[PDB]
Amino acid sequence: GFLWGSAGAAYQIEGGNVASDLWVVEHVQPTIFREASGDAVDAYHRVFDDIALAASLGFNAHRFSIEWSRIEPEKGQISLAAIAYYRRVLEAIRSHGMTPVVTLHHFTSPRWFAAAGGFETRDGIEPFVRYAEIVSRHLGDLFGVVATFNEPNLGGLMSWGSLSKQIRPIVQASRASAARAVNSDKFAPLVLGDFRIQTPIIIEAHERAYDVIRRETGGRTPVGLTIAVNDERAGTPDAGLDAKLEDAVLPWVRARGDFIGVQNYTYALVGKDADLPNPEGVELTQMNYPFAPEALEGAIRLVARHTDKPIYVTENGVATEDDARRVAFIDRAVPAVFACMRDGIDVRGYIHWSFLDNWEWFAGFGPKFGLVAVDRTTFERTPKPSAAHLGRLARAGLPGDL
Numbered sequence: 001g002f003l004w005g006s007a008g009a010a011y012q013i014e015g016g017n018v019a020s021d022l023w024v025v026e027h028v029q030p031t032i033f034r035e036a037s038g039d040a041v042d043a044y045h046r047v048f049d050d051i052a053l054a055a056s057l058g059f060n061a062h063r064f065s066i067e068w069s070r071i072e073p074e075k076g077q078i079s080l081a082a083i084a085y086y087r088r089v090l091e092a093i094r095s096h097g098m099t100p101v102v103t104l105h106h107f108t109s110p111r112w113f114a115a116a117g118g119f120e121t122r123d124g125i126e127p128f129v130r131y132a133e134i135v136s137r138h139l140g141d142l143f144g145v146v147a148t149f150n151e152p153n154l155g156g157l158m159s160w161g162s163l164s165k166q167i168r169p170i171v172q173a174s175r176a177s178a179a180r181a182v183n184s185d186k187f188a189p190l191v192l193g194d195f196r197i198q199t200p201i202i203i204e205a206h207e208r209a210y211d212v213i214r215r216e217t218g219g220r221t222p223v224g225l226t227i228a229v230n231d232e233r234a235g236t237p238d239a240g241l242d243a244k245l246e247d248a249v250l251p252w253v254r255a256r257g258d259f260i261g262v263q264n265y266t267y268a269l270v271g272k273d274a275d276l277p278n279p280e281g282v283e284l285t286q287m288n289y290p291f292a293p294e295a296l297e298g299a300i301r302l303v304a305r306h307t308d309k310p311i312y313v314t315e316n317g318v319a320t321e322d323d324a325r326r327v328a329f330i331d332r333a334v335p336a337v338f339a340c341m342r343d344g345i346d347v348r349g350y351i352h353w354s355f356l357d358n359w360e361w362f363a364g365f366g367p368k369f370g371l372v373a374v375d376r377t378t379f380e381r382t383p384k385p386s387a388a389h390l391g392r393l394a395r396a397g398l399p400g401d402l
Contacts, residue, residue, distance in 0.1 A: 001060075001397075002348060002349060002350070002397065002398055003060060003061035003099055003101070003145070003312065003348065003349025003350065003351065004058070004059050004060050004061060004349070004350060004351075004390075004393075004394030004397075005054075005059050005060065005061030005062055005063050005098070005099070005101060005349065005350070005351040005352070006054055006059055006062065006063065006351065006352050006353075006354065006355035006371060007063035007064075007101075007314065007315055007351050007352065007353045007354055007355065008043065008050075008063065008064050008065070008354055008355050008356060008358065009064075009065045009103065009106040009107070009150065009358075010064070010065045010066065010067035010070075010106060010108075011037060011040070011065075011067065011106065011107065011108045011359070012037070012040060012354075012358040012359045012360070012361070013040050013041050013043035013356055013358045013359070014040055014042075014043050014044040014047075014067065015037070015038065015039035015040040015041070015042045015043070015044055016038075016039060016044060017037070017067055017069055017070070017108065019069035019070065019073040019110055019111060020067065020069040020108040020109065020110065020111065021069075021108060021109050021110065021111050021113070021114035021115075021118075021178070021187065021189040022037070022107070022108050022189055022191075023037070023111075024111055024114075024178045024181055024182055024187070025174055025175070025178045025187075025189060025192070027181075028174055028177035028178050028180075028181050029174075029177055030170055030173050030174055030177070031174065032167065032170055032171055032174050032362055033361070033362055033364070034362060034363060034364035034366070035359075035364030035365060037359045039376070039379075040358055040359045041356050041357070041358050041359075041374040041376065041379060042379040043356070043358075045379075046379055046381070047064075047089055047092070048088075048089075048092050049381070050355060050356065050372075050381070051089075051092045051093055051096055051098070052092075052096055053372070053381065053383070054096075054098065054355060055096035055097055055098055057371075057383070057387050057388060057390075057391035057394075058388075058391035058392065058394045058395045059098060059390075059391065059394055060097065060098055060099060060394065061098055061099040061100075061101050061144070061145075061349060061351060062093045062098045062099070062100055062101065063101035063102075063103065063314060063351050064089065064100070064101075064102065064103065065102070065103035065104070065105070065106035065150065066086050066102060066103070066104055066135055066139075067082075067106075067108065068104070068105060068108075068109060068110055068113075068128075068131055069108060069109065069110040069111070070082035070085075070086075071083060071086075071131065071134065071135060072110055072127075072131060072134075073110060074110070074112055075110075075112045075113075075127065078134060083134075083135070083138045083139065086135075086139060087138065087139055087142070090102075090139055090142035090143070091142065093142075093144075094142060099144035099145065100142060100143060100144040100145075101144055101145045101146075101147070101312075101314070101349075101351060102139075102143050102144070102145070102146050102147070103147045103149075103150045103226070104131070104132055104135065104146065104147065104148050104149070104209070105128065105148060105149045105150065105190070106150040107150065107151075107189070107190060107191040107361075108189065108190075108191075109189060109190060111182060113127060113128075114178075114186075114187050114188050114189045115179070115182050115184040115186060115187055116184075116186065117186040117188050118186075118188035118189060118190055118193055118198075119188070119190055119193060119198045119201045119202045119205065120186070120188045120193050120194060120197045120198055120201070121201070122201055122204070124201065124205065125201060125204055125205040125208065128205045128209060129205060129208045129209050129212055132148065132209035132212055132213055133209075133212045133213075133216065136212060136213045136215075136216035136217060137216055140213065140216045140217040140221065141217070143217060143221045144221070145221070145222050145259075145312065145349075146213055146217075146221055146222065146223045146224070147223075147224055147225055147226045147261050147314065148205075148206045148209045148210065148213070148223065148224070148225050149190075149202060149206055149225045149226070150225075150226050150261075150263075150314075151226055151227055151228045151263060152190065152198070152199075152202045152206075152225065152227070152252065153195070153199070153227045153228060153248050153249065153252045154191065154195075154228050155191070155193065155194070155195035155198070156195035156196075156199065156247040156248035157228050157230070157244075157247075157248035157249075159195060159247065159248075160244050160247070160248070160268070160270065160274050160275045161274070161275050162274065162275070162277075165274075171192055174192075175187050175188070175189075175192055190202070191361075195247070195248075199251055199252075200251070203251060203252065203255045206225055206255060206256075206257070207255060207256045207257075210223050210224075210256055210257060222258040222259050222310075223257065223258050224257035224258050224259040224260060224261060224309070224312075225252065225255070225257060225260070225261065226260075226261025226262070226263050226312075226314040226315070227249065227252045227253070227260065227261065227262070227263065228248075228263050228264070228315075229249065229262050229263065229264050229299040229300075229302060229303060230264065230265075230266065230267055230268040230295070230298075230299060231264065231266070231267035231268070231292070231294075231295035231296075231297070231298030231299050231302070232244065232245070232267070232268050232270055232298070232302060233267055233268065233269055233270065233298070234269075234270060235269030235270050235271050235275070235276040236271050236272060236276070238272045239270045239271060239272065240270060240271065240272050240273055240274075241270055243273075244270055245306075249302070249303075249306070250306060253303060253306050253307045253309075254306070254307070257309060258309070258310070259309050259310045259311065259312055259348070260303055260307060260309050260310075260311055260312075261311075261312045261313075261314030261315075262299055262300055262303055262311050262312065262313050262314065263313075263314050263315030263316070263353075264295055264296050264298075264299035264300070264313075264315070264316060265285075265287070265289070265292075265295070265315075265316070265317065265318070266285075266289040266290050266291075266292045266295050267290060267292050267295040267298060278290060285318050285319045285320055285367075286319035286320060286321070286363075286366060286367040286368065287319045287360075287363070287367060291318065291320075291325070291329065293318075293328075293329045293330070293332035293333035293336060294332060294333075294336055296313070296316055296333050296336040296337065297336035297337070297339055297340055300313070300336070300337065300340040300345060300347060301340060301345070304340070304345045309346075310346045310347075310348050311340075311345065311346060311347045311348065312347070312348050312349045312351070313337060313347065313349060313350045313351055314349075314351050315351065315352075315353040316333055316350065316351070316352055316353060317329075317352050317353035317354060317369050318369070319360065319367035319368060319369045320368060321368050323384040323385055323386050324385075326371075326384070326386045327385060327386050327389055330352070330386060330389065330390055330393065334350065334393055337350055338398075338399060338401075338402070341398075341402050342401055342402070352371065352390055353369055354369040354370045354371070355370060355371055355372055356370040356371075356372045356373075356374055356381065357369065357370035357372070357373050357374050358370065358374075370384070371383065371384055371386050371387035371390060372384065372387055
């Protein structure tokens with residue numbers, strides 16, 4: 001049945017991911033990271049409590065990522081302890097009646113992989129595939145739904161914003177500093193790589209990993225990818241919508257796969273060659289883009305205009321210090337999904353970002369996306385009202401129409 005879940009990503013919640021490329025990036029100059037990820041919210045130790053709490057809130061699905069840097073800290077060196085740890089995670093999700101939604105790659109890579117150029121060179125396809133195979137061999141029988149890559153299209157999507165053009169040389173500088181730090185001519189974390197180079201290479205790696213995963217799970221597990229999708233709206237009559245979609249959406253939607261994971265937060269006003277500034281008058285989130293749950297519908301519709309694949313909402317949420325606003329956002333976001341399904345669009349789940357307040361990459365711990373707050377001295381969890389709220393929406397489930 002329809003999935004009702006919460007989401008997290010390993011690097012943003014687990015803590016201690018020293019083997020991951022973004023750690024090196026975190027500790028060089030110049031600095032693009034506000035704040036070290038460090039311990040995040042210590043979900044490495046608290047994950048089982050989090051799973052029991054999620055089940056208890058009424059969710060039937062649990063999205064999490066497997067951190068490749070734990071499984072393969074050095075090239076060709078496989079951590080059986082990390083594989084067993086993630087198997088305990090999966091079995092804990094199953095034990096509490098939930099469908100595991102597993103992300104194999106969520107922005108970060110092992111240091112050596114970035115140092116070899118990551119996905120900016122086709123040499124990067126082979127290791128990922130092999131990684132996707134190993135985990136599939138060891139854990140595949142417990143997978144519920146599998147996304148190979150989380151938002152590999154983010155670079156192309158945000159290349160239409162002004163921020164990315166302004167910060168770009170600082171990002172490339174910290175890349176070069178990291179490369180020096182690891183004694184390499186290259187350091188290319190996926191989320192810091194050039195989307196124009198990476199997009200076809202990553203797509204190729206996804207289709208190969210797709211075949212391998214389908215093989216290792218006897219074709220019984222949906223395998224796909226997730227992409228960031230705005231509600232893209234024409235901001236001037238000569239909007240570059242066609243070009244932006246070729247840059248950021250269409251190649252990913254057209255790749256082989258069992259579904260498209262739609263991850264939407266807001267709308268974008270698209271000019272001729274770049275996005276337009278935010279319309280002022282309008283409420284923003286901590287991420288400094290408009291508060292807009294209805295955008296979800298647009299996003300879904302957008303994807304449905306260009307594929308017949310089933311759609312999962314693998315991320316949807318709001319960064320705010322005021323949880324009442326998240327309650328309103330959710331009360332408007334779920335009916336948007338329902339509208340899309342009433343028009344025959346095949347949506348198969350709604351997964352909220354995020355379960356916990358966690359480390360929001362460059363912005364640090366500032367942005368509060370979670371249904372559950374965390375004291376980062378004790379790592380105690382305190383559910384916000386929205387947690388039990390969305391829980392009750394999950395129990396209510398689909399309307400009679402659907």
